[PDB]
Amino acid sequence: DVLGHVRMAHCNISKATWNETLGKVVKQLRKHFGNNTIIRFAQSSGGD
Amino acid sequence: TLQCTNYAPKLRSMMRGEIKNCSFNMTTELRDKKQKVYSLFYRLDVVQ
């Protein structure tokens, strides 16, 4: 049984930290593609 | 074969329909007798 309310499992990540980390990743990633490109991130597509 | 209903039919949040209350027989210590077991399963583990 559940000794209380049913709640959704979840996980929190700091928003500013993630945005800064992703910015660092793009800054380093551009070195292999060029400084006049657009780097876009998207979620996964197929599979289970 | 499991006979399942929704665990929390009045939930108006996520987890609505994610946890199912499934009835099944299952064996006991002796091969001549069966029991009746009620348990909850997550939707991802159970297919219709």
Epitope: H5, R7, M8, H10 | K10, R12, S13, M14
Partner: antibody, heavy 125, light 105 residues
Framework: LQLQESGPGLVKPSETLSLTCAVS????????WNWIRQPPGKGLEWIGY????????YYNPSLKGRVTISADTSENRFSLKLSSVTAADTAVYYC???????????????????????WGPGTPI | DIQMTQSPSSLSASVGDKVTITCHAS??????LAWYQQKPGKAPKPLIY???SLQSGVPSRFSGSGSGTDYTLTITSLQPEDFATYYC?????????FGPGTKLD
């Protein structure tokens, strides 16, 4: 805190009715918003509601399909659309505010609501 | 679709009388019952939420209680502003429903 509705005073058969409600003195994200119908001489019928910060919507099994409820927090407003309006849908429509008692994550609708604390003037249709 | 009834459908009363309005649910609603007062031509206004909790701004003359399937609203002094149609709202489960209403006269 005042709620004020608007929209056409009547639509023709098979047209979509679009009603709006403005929130003045408060913020949509902290409350849930309900729409209630009252045909003339009859009692109250719940149409549906939309949450605040979660954006989730729920509809009555009556008025099956047809009903769309939405909100726009950038203008602190929300609206109701009813497609394929017929003669039986003429009524006074109200918007209303409901409180949220939060026990879990608000963005997952982990709260108890349903009480109506504030009613608008009403819009006869 | 939870059903709700009210009793009486019309209650005869004079000014200053103590009155009780009852509501009967088809199933236990765990006290998640709200009471509203509606006047002709106006939107209903709140009185009570969660069966017994009084809404802020509502005179202390209004009270109520109940459990299970049986709930009551008590008005201790029926002043002229209180001759209104009263409604029960059941929010324990969705869709939300309302009773037929009881008229005071």
């Amino acid at each position: 805190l005042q709620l004020q509705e608007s929209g056409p005073g009547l639509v023709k058969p098979s047209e979509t009715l679009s009603l709006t409600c403005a929130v003045s003195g408060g913020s949509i994200s902290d409350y849930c918003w309900n729409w209630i119908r009252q045909p003339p001489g009859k009692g109250l019928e719940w149409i549906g509601y939309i949450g605040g910060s979660s954006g989730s919507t729920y509809y009555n099994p009556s008025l099956k399909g047809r009903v769309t409820i939405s909100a726009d927090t950038s203008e602190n407003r929300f609206s109701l659309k009813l497609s394929s309006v017929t003669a039986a849908d003429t009524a006074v429509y109200y918007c209303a505010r409901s409180p949220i008692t939060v026990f879990g994550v608000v963005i997952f609708d982990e709260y108890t609501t349903g009480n109506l604390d504030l009613w608008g003037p009403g819009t006869p249709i | 679709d939870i059903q709700m009834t009210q009793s009486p459908s019309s209650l005869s009363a004079s000014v200053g009388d103590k009155v009780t309005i009852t509501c009967h649910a088809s199933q236990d609603i765990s006290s998640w019952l709200a009471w509203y007062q509606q006047k002709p031509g106006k939107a209903p206004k709140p009185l009570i939420y969660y069966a017994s909790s009084l809404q802020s701004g509502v005179p202390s003359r209004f009270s109520g209680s109940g459990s299970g399937t049986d709930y009551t609203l008590t008005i201790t002094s029926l002043q002229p502003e209180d001759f209104a149609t009263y409604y029960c709202q059941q929010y324990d489960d969705l869709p939300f429903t309302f009773g037929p209403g009881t008229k005071l006269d």
